[PDB]
């Protein structure tokens, strides 16, 4: 998906609660489940990518971190 598309999806779930410019791990799980169900298949690397990308260790990732996460978890 294009970044413009990806931004709209990210915002929709981040808006659920907390900071509208961050996504917690649970918000990311609901987002993948409904938007990219195929990315949640077989052994997962979600927690490893999540831990590496959440640099400030606050349990949340920014839009650019999310983009990287979708990209990497896909290959
Ligand atoms: Mn963070």
Coordinates of N, CA, C and O and ligand atoms in Angstrom, one line a residue:
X1 N 0.9 -1.2 0.0 CA 0.0 0.0 0.0 C 0.9 1.2 0.0 O 2.0 1.2 0.5
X2 N 0.4 2.3 -0.6 CA 1.1 3.5 -0.7 C 1.0 4.1 0.7 O 0.2 3.8 1.5
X3 N 2.0 5.0 1.0 CA 2.2 5.7 2.3 C 1.0 6.5 2.6 O 0.7 6.7 3.8
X4 N 0.4 7.2 1.6 CA -0.8 8.0 1.9 C -1.9 7.1 2.4 O -2.6 7.4 3.3
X5 N -2.0 5.9 1.8 CA -3.0 4.9 2.2 C -2.6 4.5 3.6 O -3.4 4.3 4.5
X6 N -1.3 4.1 3.8 CA -0.8 3.6 5.1 C -1.1 4.6 6.2 O -1.4 4.2 7.3
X7 N -1.0 5.9 5.9 CA -1.2 7.0 6.9 C -2.6 7.0 7.4 O -2.9 7.2 8.6
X8 N -3.5 6.9 6.5 CA -5.0 6.9 6.8 C -5.3 5.7 7.7 O -6.1 5.9 8.6
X9 N -4.8 4.5 7.5 CA -5.0 3.3 8.3 C -4.4 3.6 9.7 O -5.1 3.3 10.7
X10 N -3.1 4.0 9.7 CA -2.4 4.2 11.0 C -3.3 5.2 11.8 O -3.6 4.9 13.0
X11 N -3.7 6.3 11.3 CA -4.4 7.3 12.0 C -5.7 6.9 12.6 O -6.2 7.3 13.7
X12 N -6.4 6.0 11.9 CA -7.7 5.5 12.3 C -7.6 4.7 13.6 O -8.4 4.8 14.5
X13 N -6.5 3.9 13.7 CA -6.3 3.0 14.9 C -5.7 3.8 16.0 O -5.9 3.5 17.2
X14 N -4.8 4.7 15.7 CA -4.1 5.5 16.7 C -5.1 6.4 17.4 O -5.0 6.7 18.6
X15 N -6.1 6.8 16.7 CA -7.2 7.7 17.2 C -8.0 7.0 18.3 O -8.7 7.7 19.1
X16 N -8.0 5.7 18.4 CA -8.8 4.9 19.3 C -8.6 5.5 20.8 O -9.5 5.7 21.5
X17 N -7.3 5.6 21.2 CA -7.0 6.1 22.5 C -5.5 6.6 22.6 O -4.7 6.3 21.6
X18 N -5.2 7.3 23.6 CA -3.8 7.8 23.9 C -3.5 8.9 22.9 O -4.3 9.7 22.4
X19 N -2.2 8.9 22.5 CA -1.6 9.8 21.6 C -2.1 9.5 20.1 O -1.9 8.4 19.6
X20 N -2.7 10.5 19.4 CA -3.2 10.2 18.1 C -2.0 10.0 17.1 O -2.3 9.7 16.0
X21 N -0.8 10.2 17.5 CA 0.4 10.1 16.6 C 1.2 8.9 16.9 O 2.3 8.8 16.3
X22 N 0.7 7.9 17.7 CA 1.4 6.7 18.1 C 0.4 5.6 18.1 O -0.8 5.8 18.2
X23 N 1.0 4.4 18.0 CA 0.2 3.1 18.0 C 0.8 2.2 19.0 O 2.0 2.0 19.0
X24 N 0.0 1.7 20.0 CA 0.6 0.8 21.0 C 0.6 -0.6 20.3 O 0.0 -0.8 19.2
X25 N 1.2 -1.6 21.0 CA 1.2 -2.9 20.4 C -0.2 -3.5 20.1 O -0.5 -4.2 19.1
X26 N -1.2 -3.3 21.0 CA -2.5 -3.9 20.9 C -3.3 -3.3 19.8 O -4.1 -3.9 19.1
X27 N -3.1 -1.9 19.6 CA -3.8 -1.2 18.5 C -3.2 -1.8 17.1 O -3.9 -1.9 16.1
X28 N -1.9 -2.1 17.2 CA -1.2 -2.6 16.0 C -1.8 -4.0 15.7 O -2.1 -4.3 14.6
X29 N -1.9 -4.8 16.7 CA -2.5 -6.1 16.5 C -3.9 -6.1 15.9 O -4.1 -6.9 14.9
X30 N -4.8 -5.2 16.4 CA -6.1 -5.1 15.7 C -6.0 -4.6 14.3 O -6.8 -5.0 13.4
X31 N -5.1 -3.6 14.1 CA -4.9 -3.1 12.7 C -4.5 -4.2 11.8 O -5.1 -4.3 10.7
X32 N -3.5 -5.1 12.1 CA -3.0 -6.1 11.3 C -4.1 -7.2 11.0 O -4.3 -7.6 9.9
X33 N -4.7 -7.6 12.1 CA -5.8 -8.5 12.0 C -6.9 -8.1 11.0 O -7.4 -8.9 10.2
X34 N -7.3 -6.9 11.0 CA -8.3 -6.5 10.1 C -7.8 -6.0 8.7 O -8.4 -6.3 7.7
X35 N -6.7 -5.3 8.7 CA -6.2 -4.7 7.5 C -5.2 -5.5 6.7 O -5.1 -5.4 5.4
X36 N -4.4 -6.3 7.4 CA -3.3 -7.1 6.7 C -3.3 -8.5 7.4 O -2.3 -8.9 7.9
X37 N -4.5 -9.2 7.4 CA -4.6 -10.5 8.0 C -3.5 -11.5 7.6 O -3.1 -12.3 8.4
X38 N -3.1 -11.4 6.4 CA -2.0 -12.3 5.9 C -0.7 -12.1 6.6 O 0.1 -13.0 6.7
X39 N -0.5 -10.9 7.1 CA 0.8 -10.6 7.8 C 0.9 -11.1 9.2 O 2.0 -11.2 9.8
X40 N -0.3 -11.6 9.7 CA -0.3 -12.2 11.0 C -0.2 -13.8 10.9 O -0.7 -14.5 11.8
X41 N 0.3 -14.3 9.9 CA 0.4 -15.8 9.7 C 1.7 -16.4 10.0 O 2.8 -15.8 9.7
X42 N 1.7 -17.7 10.4 CA 2.8 -18.5 10.7 C 3.6 -17.9 11.8 O 3.2 -17.0 12.5
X43 N 4.9 -18.5 12.1 CA 5.6 -17.9 13.2 C 5.8 -16.4 13.0 O 6.2 -15.9 11.9
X44 N 5.5 -15.6 14.1 CA 5.7 -14.2 14.0 C 6.9 -13.5 14.5 O 7.5 -13.9 15.6
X45 N 7.3 -12.4 13.8 CA 8.4 -11.6 14.2 C 7.9 -10.3 14.7 O 8.6 -9.3 14.8
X46 N 6.6 -10.2 15.0 CA 6.0 -8.9 15.4 C 6.6 -8.4 16.7 O 7.0 -7.2 16.7
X47 N 6.8 -9.2 17.7 CA 7.4 -8.7 18.9 C 8.9 -8.3 18.8 O 9.3 -7.4 19.5
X48 N 9.6 -9.0 17.9 CA 11.0 -8.7 17.8 C 11.1 -7.3 17.0 O 11.8 -6.4 17.5
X49 N 10.4 -7.2 15.9 CA 10.4 -5.9 15.2 C 9.9 -4.8 16.1 O 10.5 -3.8 16.1
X50 N 8.8 -5.0 16.8 CA 8.2 -4.0 17.7 C 9.2 -3.5 18.7 O 9.4 -2.3 18.9
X51 N 9.9 -4.4 19.4 CA 10.9 -4.1 20.4 C 12.1 -3.3 19.8 O 12.6 -2.3 20.4
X52 N 12.5 -3.6 18.6 CA 13.6 -3.0 18.0 C 13.3 -1.6 17.5 O 14.1 -0.7 17.6
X53 N 12.1 -1.4 17.0 CA 11.6 -0.1 16.5 C 11.1 1.0 17.6 O 11.2 2.2 17.3
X54 N 10.6 0.5 18.7 CA 10.1 1.4 19.7 C 11.4 1.9 20.4 O 11.7 1.4 21.6
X55 N 12.1 2.7 19.8 CA 13.4 3.1 20.3 C 13.4 3.7 21.7 O 14.2 3.5 22.6
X56 N 12.4 4.6 22.0 CA 12.3 5.2 23.3 C 11.6 4.4 24.4 O 11.3 4.8 25.5
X57 N 11.3 3.1 24.0 CA 10.8 2.1 24.9 C 9.5 2.4 25.6 O 9.2 2.0 26.7
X58 N 8.6 3.2 25.0 CA 7.4 3.6 25.6 C 6.1 2.7 25.2 O 5.0 3.1 25.6
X59 N 6.4 1.6 24.6 CA 5.3 0.7 24.2 C 4.5 1.2 23.0 O 3.5 0.7 22.7
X60 N 5.1 2.2 22.4 CA 4.4 2.7 21.2 C 5.4 3.1 20.0 O 6.5 3.4 20.3
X61 N 4.9 3.0 18.8 CA 5.6 3.3 17.6 C 5.0 4.5 16.8 O 3.8 4.7 16.7
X62 N 5.9 5.3 16.2 CA 5.4 6.4 15.3 C 5.0 5.9 14.0 O 5.1 4.7 13.7
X63 N 4.5 6.8 13.1 CA 4.1 6.4 11.7 C 5.2 5.8 10.9 O 5.1 4.7 10.4
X64 N 6.4 6.4 10.9 CA 7.5 5.9 10.2 C 8.0 4.5 10.7 O 8.3 3.6 9.9
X65 N 7.9 4.3 12.0 CA 8.2 3.0 12.6 C 7.3 1.9 12.1 O 7.7 0.8 11.8
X66 N 6.0 2.3 12.1 CA 5.0 1.4 11.6 C 5.2 1.0 10.1 O 5.0 -0.1 9.7
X67 N 5.6 2.0 9.3 CA 5.9 1.7 7.9 C 6.9 0.7 7.8 O 6.8 -0.2 7.0
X68 N 8.0 1.0 8.5 CA 9.2 0.0 8.5 C 8.7 -1.4 8.9 O 9.0 -2.4 8.3
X69 N 7.9 -1.4 10.0 CA 7.4 -2.7 10.5 C 6.6 -3.5 9.5 O 6.8 -4.7 9.3
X70 N 5.7 -2.9 8.8 CA 4.9 -3.5 7.7 C 5.8 -4.1 6.6 O 5.6 -5.2 6.2
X71 N 6.7 -3.2 6.2 CA 7.7 -3.6 5.2 C 8.5 -4.9 5.6 O 8.5 -5.9 4.8
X72 N 9.1 -4.8 6.7 CA 9.9 -5.9 7.1 C 9.2 -7.2 7.5 O 9.6 -8.3 7.1
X73 N 8.1 -7.1 8.1 CA 7.3 -8.3 8.5 C 6.8 -9.0 7.3 O 6.5 -10.2 7.3
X74 N 6.8 -8.3 6.1 CA 6.3 -8.9 4.8 C 7.3 -9.7 4.1 O 6.9 -10.3 3.2
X75 N 8.6 -9.7 4.5 CA 9.5 -10.4 3.7 C 10.4 -11.5 4.4 O 10.6 -12.6 3.8
Ligands
LIG1 MN1 8.1 4.4 21.1

